Amino acid sequence: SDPVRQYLHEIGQVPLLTLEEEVELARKVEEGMEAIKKLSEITGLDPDLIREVVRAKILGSARVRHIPGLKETLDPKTVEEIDQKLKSLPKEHKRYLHIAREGEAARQHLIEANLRLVVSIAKKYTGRGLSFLDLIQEGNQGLIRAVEKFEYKRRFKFSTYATWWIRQAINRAIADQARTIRIPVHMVETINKLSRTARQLQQELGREPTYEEIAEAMGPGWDAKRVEETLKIAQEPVSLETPIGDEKDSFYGDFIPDEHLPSPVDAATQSLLSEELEKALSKLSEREAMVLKLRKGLIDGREHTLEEVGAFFGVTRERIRQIENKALRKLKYHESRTRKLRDFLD
């Protein structure tokens, strides 16, 4: 029913490691990685492909999918070929395979055992724009990074090194996903810094600070305009479904006109404009009207050069320019005469 409760149950299933269990798991993981590198040395194959194969057989055929980094599409066929190629190796070499498998299994068990930490850390990041479950999952990504990067040699407990990467992943998630209009992480940092600055400033000023005071507190490079524009780009959008009035019958979006699609008046005006332009062009001859329509783009929509209309009508560019000139001139005279195209000039 409640997804969080359900997940907390599934997490409550796997029991917490002891110091020895943790050390052994980490050790098996590390030695497993070493073994994969060794198998890469021996076989002369790609360490990543080998890792994906070992992980494939450990996880089973329940999960097999093409890895973005891998060169070959990963399917039961290819993993069977590679597995059999790994079965083809001498006892001391074939040993490293077992080391690798044990490594993967240890990795899985390590993550699964440490899933609680992620929750305990993520519970404090709520209200920041991401759901609890999302924070948890991103934190889980962090946990995975921590597992693959851990060194048991340092004798530090796993939680210490894990927490760093977990917080890292949660915060990266918050910075990346939380805005309908996405903002770069460094810019989000600058914006939050501006917020904290303004909040401290207001905490000592007994009022909201001006742009100038914030600019002062931000240091050199920061003036009022920079603070103002930074606050401008930080603005988040508002819902079109935002309710208006105490009833349920009015949306905020109902008050917003469409500026894109031309109005009936605008359309009709463009129509009468085209018709009138044709009327005026019909007082010219075929050639000068056509030259004008070509140069101004009434024909294909593009505006032809003098050399194009000149090569089209078979005259010099000077000539075509001259007939364009006289065309425009006759149009000017007729326009002064009938005053027909004047009203379309606004």
Partner DNA sequence: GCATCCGTGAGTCGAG
Partner DNA sequence: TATAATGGGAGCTGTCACGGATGC
Q: At 57, list the tokens.
A: 């057989």
Partners of residue 243 on adjacent β-strands: 251
Q: At 8, list the tokens.
A: 């907390």
Ligand-binding site membership of 165 (annotated):
no
Single residue of 25, 35, 49, 97 touching another protein by CB under 8 A: 97
Contact 194, 188 (CB under 8 A): no
- The item of another protein, DNA, Mg ion, none sharing an interface with residue 278, based on CB under 5 to 8 Å by kind, is none
Positive/negative CA dihedral, 64, 66, 68, 69: positive
- The distance of closest approach from Cβ of residue 296 to DNA in the complex, given in angstroms and rounded to an integer, is 45
Positive/negative CA dihedral, 191, 193, 196, 202: negative
Which residues, 6+ apart, have CB-to-CB distance to 185 below 8 Å?
Answer: 172, 175, 176
Interruption sites in the chain after residues (C→N beyond 2.5 Å): none
Contact 182, 162 (CB under 8 A): no
Distance, in Å, from the CA atom of 88 to the CA atom of 77, rounded to the nearest integer, reads 17
Nearer to DNA, 138 or 213 (CB): 138
b/e per residue 279-314 (b: at least 16 CB within 10 A): ebbeebeeebbbbbbbbeebeeeeebebeebbeeee
Count of C-beta atoms within a 10 Å radius of residue 274: 11
- The distance of closest approach from Cβ of residue 328 to DNA in the complex, given in angstroms and rounded to an integer, is 50
Distance, in Å, from the CA atom of 192 to the CA atom of 292, rounded to the nearest integer, reads 58
Tell me the per-residue interface mask from 145 to 174 with DNA, x by CB under 7 A, - otherwise: ----xxx--x-xxxxxxxxx----------
The reply on whether position 50 binds another protein by CB under 8 A is no
- The item of Mg ion, DNA, another protein, none sharing an interface with residue 98, based on CB under 5 to 8 Å by kind, is another protein
The reply on whether position 134 binds another protein by CB under 8 A is yes
Q: At 238, list the tokens.
A: 């508002």
Phi and psi at 236, nearest 5°, equal -90, 150
Q: Which of residues 14-53 bind DNA (CB under 7 A)?
A: 16-17, 22
- The distance of closest approach from Cβ of residue 10 to DNA in the complex, given in angstroms and rounded to an integer, is 8
The reply on whether position 58 binds another protein by CB under 8 A is yes
The reply on whether position 252 binds DNA by CB under 7 A is no
Ligand-binding site membership of 343 (annotated):
yes
Q: Which of residues 228-247 bind DNA (CB under 7 A)?
A: 244-247
Contact 330, 284 (CB under 8 A): yes
Interface residues toward another protein, by CB under 8 A: 6-7, 10-11, 13-14, 18-21, 23-24, 27, 52, 55, 57-60, 62-63, 65, 67-68, 86-87, 91, 94-95, 97-99, 101-102, 104-105, 108, 111-112, 115, 134, 137-138, 140-141, 144, 152-153, 155, 177, 180-181, 235-242, 252-253, 256
Known binding-site positions? 72, 88, 215, 219, 222, 246, 249, 340, 343
Interface residues toward DNA, by CB under 7 A: 2, 4-5, 8-9, 11-13, 16-17, 22, 113-117, 119-120, 123-124, 126, 132, 149-151, 154, 156-164, 244-247, 249-250
Known binding-site positions for Mg(2+)? 72, 88, 215, 219, 222, 246, 249, 340, 343
